[PDB]
Amino acid sequence: ANLLTSLVRAHLDSGPSTAKLDYSKFQELVLKEDAGDVQQFYDLLSGSLEVIRKWAEKIPGFAELSPADQDWLLESAFLELFILRLAYRSKPGEGKLIFCSGLVLHRLQCARGFGDWIDSILAFSRSLHSLLVDVPAFACLSALVLITDRHGLQEPRRVEELQNRIASCLKEHVAAVAGASCLSRLLGKLPELRTLCTQGLQRIFYLKLEDLVPPPPIIDKIFMETLPF
Amino acid sequence: ANLLTSLVRAHLDSGPSTAKLDYSKFQELVLPHFGKEDAGDVQQFYDLLSGSLEVIRKWAEKIPGFAELSPADQDWLLESAFLELFILRLAYRSKPGEGKLIFCSGLVLHRLQCARGFGDWIDSILAFSRSLHSLLVDVPAFACLSALVLITDRHGLQEPRRVEELQNRIASCLKEHVAAVAASCLSRLLGKLPELRTLCTQGLQRIFYLKLEDLVPPPPIIDKIFMETLPF
Structure with missing residues (x-):
């Protein structure tokens, strides 16, 4: 109720307004993988990092969890969060990806950096779109991706209550x-989203292997620490 | 030559002869559920990697000069080249025109029987097999090439110059x-080298993925190779 309103206010402020969308770099007709593509992949991921953390700070209760539990929940769900909010925000019928800064890109502008990861994300977005999820339901769904069981929580019962x-x-x-x-x-869509996170872990692994551009430290950290091994 | 003969002898003993070919598990048609795998498929995949590694170890022990290298350099060369060796010997042995994979021990499996354990990787290995076959590399040239894949510069050798001499x-x-x-x-x-190099990468990706899945744990020595051949 008031919880609901707070989750909504938190979601809407965490993204761009249709007025602040940037079509500056959008090229529908886009004329191996090189280093511009790998850099843009890391940049796009890196753009949501601070956005999702400020968004979580506004979920009521999240800041009453232990600080170690806050960091681990964020770190464990970052990839899924990034995917769900991108799938919801984008327009898969026209190949349009919309990122949380407002940047709009065509998928062909993204294919080389993301690999087929990106097609999997667009199928999920089509799927999620057909469900016609309203904003309050989505504001609940995303918060439930964050606030979920993870191995190694200090206070797993308090995470469960929330x-x-x-x-x-x-x-x-x-x-x-x-x-x-x-x-x-x-x-x-929670379990689809977990399987889709897997696919992103595979893409970072592959790119770290290639090593055209190294991942930035905080992406590298999330990758290394969320690997069970 | 005498080296030649020995490399040749080492190669033919490391594989199976058109006799000792086991069709015990061969099924010319299976109907799998693509993109998924149970724990039997994953244990078979690893088992096939580890059988092939004990076979390649015994083959290397027969390359003249290899066994008096340092024991550490011996292991590092093997592990550093295992995946590449595994794919080359498998590609060279197999019969991509009947969809047949032939391993090490003699075991023959159809591409469809490999699909689940190996993923896409197995189809790309069959494509490279067709590739390698149209080159028509004879047995004494392959016995040399094979060994030059193992005996090569690797970072961290104690005696890289003994390895280079050989x-x-x-x-x-x-x-x-x-x-x-x-x-x-x-x-x-x-x-064709880049085809091969991609296929080694493709195998690392597959082990990564299955280690993530963790249906069964990888064998320790495969796991060690996967880890120490990843710079990180």
Whole structure:
């Protein structure tokens, strides 16, 4: 309710307004992988880093978790968060990727840096779009990606309480707007999203191997620490 | 030559002969669920990597000069080149025109039986097999090339110059044989190198992915190679 309103205010402020979109570099007709492409891949990921952290700071309860638990939840869900907010923001029917700064790029502008990762993300975006998720449901869904069980939490029961809180909040709101199914269908995108995060881990691994441009330290850290091994 | 003979003898004993070919598990049609794998497929994949590594170790022990290198340099050369050796010997042995993969022990498996454990990687290895076959590399030229893949400069050798001397030795022997039989085939064969190098990368990606999945843990020595051959 007031929780819901707070999750919404938090989501909308964490992205760009249709007025602040930048089509400056957009090329629908785009005429191996080189170092401009690898740099732009890391830059686009790096752009959401501070955005998602300020967004999490505004989820009620998140700052009452232990600071070690806050950092680990962010670090463990960064990739999934980046993917869900990009899939929701973008327009997959026209190949349009919209990033959280407002930059708009065509997918062919992105294919070389992202690999086929990017097509997988556009299929998920089509899929998510067909569900017609409203803004309050999405503001709940994304927060549930963050605030979830991870190995090594100091206070896993308090993470679980807050998750139940956000879940109840999502569950009402859905029921209120059209009396499993809907809910079940929306929660089904959590596991797709985990599998899609896998695919991003594979892409960083591959690029680290190539080593045209090294990943920036904080991307490299998230990659190394979220690898179970 | 005498080196030649020994390299040749070492190669033929390391593989199977058109007899000892096991069709015990061969199925000319299986219907898999693509892009997924259970723990039987993953243990078979590793088992095939590790059987091939004990076979390549015994083959290297027979290359004259290899066993008196330092034990550490011996291991590092093997591990540094295992994946490349594995793909080359597998490509050379196999029959891409019937979709057949032939391993080490004699085991024959259809491309469709490999799909789950190996991923896409196996199809790309079959494509390189067709590639390598159209070059028509004879057994004594392949016995030389194979060994020059192992005996090579690697960072961190205790005695890189002993390795280089032996590399010179096998190169000369190859050259003698290319002339006895008479750039490419050479330059033509180095032209496929990038295919191979991509396939080694493609195998690292597959182990990474399966280590992520963790249906079963990789064997320790495969895991060690994966890790120490990753600069990070």
